[PDB]
């Protein structure tokens, strides 16, 4: 969970 | 979509402070947080990030005067044992998965200082 | 933990001319091309142009490419315009040490 939805 | 910092103001070293990144129109369920500081006429500096479920991690420099959380439309960061040395803007910055960040606030100003 | 280093400032040419950066990891980022490039003016926000070390961000200027991979990374500008005259920061993501760290930031001066 470190990145998120959207590049 | 957006995010915006708030709670930038004057202190006298040794105050301690809360800032405020209020997120727009995304879950904070899905995307993760960073802080990133900048002292006047430097550089950026990555604070630490609040990922998904909770978890957090911080620079090596933090060494502990920064304590970032998060609700569901906010993420706050404590700072303590302020000096001079951290009159800076803060921004809250969006992580998109490519593991860079895809949306920033303009900034609050925290100004340490008699 | 890990140290990003960039070309020393100013890099400078003539309107029109080419402007290299390079970005340089001791450690190798994640997947070998976790590295983004930010351009940022006084008193404005960072803005993304490039992530994954090669792709542009929606609605950047095609005179902008990144390249490289592991521990070297470069942007260059050609055609370089008014326009560009900025700081640039590198920023890798890592699975060891600090997760996400900037370089220091190349300031560009455009000779007009």
């Known amino acids: 969970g470190k990145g998120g939805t959207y590049p | 979509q957006s995010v915006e910092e708030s709670g930038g103001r004057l202190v006298t070293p040794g105050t301690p402070l809360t800032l405020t990144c209020t997120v727009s129109?995304?879950?904070?369920?899905?995307?993760?947080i960073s802080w990133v500081r900048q002292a006047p006429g430097e550089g950026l500096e990555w604070v630490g990030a609040?990922?998904?479920?909770?978890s957090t991690v911080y620079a090596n420099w933090a060494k502990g005067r920064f304590t970032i959380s998060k609700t569901s439309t906010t993420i706050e960061l404590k700072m303590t044992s302020l000096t001079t040395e951290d009159t800076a803007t803060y921004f809250c910055?969006?992580?998109?998965?490519?593991?860079?960040?895809?949306?920033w606030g303009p900034g609050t100003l925290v100004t340490v200082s008699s | 933990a890990q140290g990003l280093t960039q070309t020393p400032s100013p890099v400078s040419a003539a309107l029109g001319g080419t402007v290299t950066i390079n970005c340089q990891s001791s450690?190798?980022?994640?997947?070998?091309?976790?590295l983004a490039w930010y351009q940022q003016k006084p008193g404005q926000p960072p803005k993304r142009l490039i992530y994954?070390?090669?792709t542009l961000d929606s609605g950047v200027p095609s005179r902008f490419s990144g390249s490289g991979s592991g521990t070297q990374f470069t942007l260059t500008i050609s055609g370089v315009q008014c326009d560009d005259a900025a700081t640039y920061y590198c920023?890798?993501?890592?699975?060891?040490?600090?997760?996400?760290?900037f370089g220091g930031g190349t300031e560009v001066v455009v000779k007009g």
């Open positions: 910055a969006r992580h998109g998965y490519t593991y860079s960040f895809n949306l």
């Open positions: 994954q070390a090669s």
């Open positions: 609040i990922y998904t479920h909770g």
């Open positions: 920023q890798g993501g890592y699975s060891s040490g600090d997760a996400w760290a």
């Open positions: 450690q190798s980022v994640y997947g070998n091309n976790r």
């Open positions: 129109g995304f879950s904070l369920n899905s995307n993760a």
